[PDB]
Design a protein around this ligand. Structure first.
Ligand SMILES: C=C=CCNCCCC/N=C/C=C(\C)N1c2cc(C)c(C)cc2N(C[C@H](O)[C@H](O)[C@H](O)COP(=O)(O)OP(=O)(O)OC[C@H]2O[C@@H](n3cnc4c(N)ncnc43)[C@H](O)[C@@H]2O)c2[nH]c(=O)[nH]c(=O)c21
Ligand SMILES: C=C=CCNCCCCNCC=C=C
Length: 456
């Protein structure tokens, strides 16, 4: 059948290949790195497995295709410290969570608005919190410090440096549908890859440029013509009828000018520029003995009312939201520019800084140092350049639709988490986007007979 090349071997590209390979096209998946999975990345560490990318199945239910596949594949199981060194009360934490998450729910008021009074989620949250503080008759400092951690948690969830960068009106479009895969989330992508024909995926084969809108001859005689040519970094010249591009939005942001020849249509090129693509990283620390599920950290004397969209915390580690005890391993989460700064530090500097933080935060100066560290470095990953998309101030959910828009004749199709308007930044949005592109091609192929059908 037709020649199809899929660029990228994350869940979107594998999902597209799986549907297409199930009048079979001549299909190849070109992966830049040495293994598949992309932002699903599981590593054997500390005598177990650590998730460097995606960790949870969001909304583990019947409608979630990722949950459905994990069940079919047998991958599922049956199922607060202050920087002062003292405990924070659960009641006060609850009261501040009610206030904060109540305001997050109110962002729905801005849905479908062309001209919102404030451009961002962070500005709306700051204004409402400032009005609330004016109602409060040292307790005020503790309240603002706890609210600061909730802003930082919300940054991690959005994968943004600051909630002031997240567009307000589009925020409510995202659909909220949480569990892990004990043996590794990468087990899911490995199983989809295994279902494909032998040698469908080529590893260490990064694509340099996609040439489209042409009539390209194949090397063999007589020289059959194709609309697209994929140029690999290694010099391979691969003709195709269709190319499904699943590369991350961070890669497109850096390379869209050279990756397509001719350049992309203006509206799509602008969608790539306007959308957000932030960094979220994990830091795993291994201890010989546990000193301790989730330890939330509150940084004394901090407040979300001081910060602007691009302000940094006093130190990089003050952006850390807390630690998840791994089911002796702790996993810290950090997002934004402080997380990008973290990636530039040596493994030793991260291990030693966090040991000092943990000794201060638990109020135990004799706490033994972490034995080892493993951290992700998503912003530094040349083929990703960050963690996941968000609808940034200046962009809308319409920009996600523009990311999905195919090029003429379906010569070039786009899939990936940043092409799904309601499930962007998830594994299920990426998988569904791959199935969407496969369905679009199958309909084109099934329509080709109709071109030869006379009316009379
Ligand atoms: C309880 C309760 C209530 C809830 N509140 C609690 C808070 C929990 C919030 N959850 C947070 C979840 C996070 C952080 N999770 C999280 C954490 C972190 C640190 C990250 C990094 C992500 C995530 N996500 C996002 C997904 O990982 C991501 O969207 C998809 O994997 C992308 O797939 P893809 O589009 O195919 O791209 P890919 O990048 O996978 O594939 C593209 C491929 O293209 C390749 N490529 C690039 N350029 C190329 C070239 N030139 N030539 C060839 N190949 C090229 C490249 O090498 C890749 O292999 C999560 N998603 C999810 O569902 N659960 C989660 O837990 C998280
Ligand atoms: C209502 C409400 C809140 C909507 N919050 C949007 C979350 C952004 C999507 N990120 C998902 C996780 C990951 C990765």
């Amino acid at each position: 059948g037709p020649r199809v090349l899929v660029v990228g071997s994350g869940i979107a590209g594998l999902g597209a290949a799986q549907k297409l390979c199930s009048a079979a096209p001549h299909l190849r998946v070109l992966e830049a790195t040495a293994s598949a999975g992309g932002r699903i990345r599981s590593e054997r560490c500390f005598g177990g497995v650590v998730e460097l990318g995606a960790h949870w199945i969001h909304g583990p239910s019947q409608d979630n295709p990722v949950f459905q596949l994990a069940a079919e594949f047998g991958l599922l199981g049956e199922k607060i410290w202050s920087s002062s060194g003292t405990s924070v009360s659960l009641e006060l934490m609850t009261e501040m969570a009610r206030l904060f998450y109540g305001l997050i729910e109110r962002t729905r008021e801005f849905l479908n608005e062309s001209e919102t009074p404030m451009a961002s989620v962070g500005e709306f949250l700051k204004k409402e919190i400032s009005q609330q503080v004016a109602s409060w008759t040292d307790t005020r400092k503790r309240k603002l410090a706890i609210l600061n951690t909730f802003f930082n948690i919300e940054c991690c969830v959005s994968g943004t440096h600051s909630m002031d960068l997240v567009a307000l009106a589009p925020f409510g479009e995202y659909t909220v549908l949480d569990c892990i895969l004990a043996g590794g989330y990468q087990g899911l992508t490995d199983r989809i890859l295994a279902s494909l024909p032998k040698d469908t995926v080529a590893f260490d084969k990064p694509v340099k440029t996609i040439h489209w809108n042409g009539s390209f001859q194949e090397a063999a005689f007589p020289g059959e013509t194709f609309p697209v040519l994929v140029e690999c970094e290694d010099g391979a010249r691969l003709p195709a009828h269709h190319v499904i591009v699943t590369v991350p939005l961070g890669f497109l942001k850096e390379h869209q000018d050279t990756f397509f020849e001719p350049p992309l249509p203006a509206k799509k090129a602008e969608a790539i520029k306007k959308l957000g693509f932030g960094t979220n990283n994990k830091i795993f620390l291994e201890f010989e003995e546990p000193f301790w599920q989730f330890i939330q950290v509150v940084w004394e004397d901090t407040s979300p009312l001081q910060d602007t969209a691009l302000s940094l915390q006093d130190t990089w580690f003050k952006k850390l939201i807390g630690f998840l005890v791994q089911p002796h391993v702790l996993c810290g989460f950090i997002a934004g520019l402080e997380s990008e700064f973290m990636e530039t530090l040596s493994d030793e500097e991260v291990l030693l800084s966090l040991t000092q933080v943990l000794r201060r935060v638990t109020g135990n100066p004799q706490l033994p140092a972490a034995k080892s560290v493993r951290r992700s470095q998503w912003h530094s990953a040349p083929y990703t350049r960050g963690s996941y998309s968000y609808v940034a101030v200046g962009s809308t959910g319409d920009d996600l639709d523009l990311m999905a828009q195919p090029l003429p004749g379906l010569q070039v199709l786009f899939a990936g988490e940043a092409t799904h308007r309601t499930f962007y930044s998830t594994t299920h949005g990426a998988l569904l986007s791959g199935w969407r592109e496969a369905d679009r091609l199958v309909s084109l192929w099934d329509s080709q007979v109709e071109q030869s059908r006379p009316r009379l």
